Design a protein around this ligand. Structure first.
Ligand SMILES: CCCCCCCCCCCCCCCC(=O)O[C@H](COC(=O)CCCCCCC[C@@H](C)CCCCCCCCC)COP(=O)(O)O[C@H]1[C@H](O)[C@H](O)[C@H](O)[C@@H](O)[C@@H]1O
Lengths: 55, 54
């Protein structure tokens, strides 16, 4: 019963569990985690990111 | 507690230099090209201007 409950709970919750620190967002310094990177992170070295006003 | 990194009284700074962006190596596989033409020479393309002065 303990093993079955362990397996079932883990299989129930592992779908939800995700790594926050999986490098996914590309960056000039290689793929990085989402929290480190924002829209201002240069995708490639020397990229121009204008401070565009949102009309 | 205060955050480890704060405050800088010295080193007033400098005016940022004029930004000179670089062509995208990642987004563009190669170099973006403008006018298209046969250009049976070293290469001139489909864009050629000139200003005739006095
Ligand atoms: C007693 C049980 C002993 C086992 C402990 C289990 C905890 C250790 C986990 C071991 C696996 C880690 C290495 C390999 C795996 C790995 O790297 O995955 C990580 C995440 O680990 C997972 O897989 C899922 C984690 C499992 C959920 C565990 C639930 C809590 C347990 C401890 C409580 C129930 C046990 C019974 C006790 C309570 C009894 C009741 C009184 C990160 O995911 P990520 O790289 O972002 O990819 C995402 C894919 O995982 C993701 O499933 C997928 O859905 C995507 O969303 C994807 O993005």
């Amino acid at each position: 019963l303990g093993a079955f409950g362990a397996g079932t709970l883990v299989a129930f919750i592992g779908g939800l569990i995700k790594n926050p620190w999986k490098p996914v967002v590309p960056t000039a310094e290689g793929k990085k985690a989402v929290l480190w990177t924002s829209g201002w992170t240069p995708r490639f070295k020397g990229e121009t990111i204008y401070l565009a006003r949102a009309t | 507690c205060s955050p480890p990194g704060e405050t800088a009284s010295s080193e007033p700074g400098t005016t940022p230099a004029i930004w000179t962006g670089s062509p995208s190596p990642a987004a563009p596989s190669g170099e973006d090209h403008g006018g298209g033409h046969g250009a049976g020479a070293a290469g001139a393309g489909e864009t050629l201007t000139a200003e005739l002065k006095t």
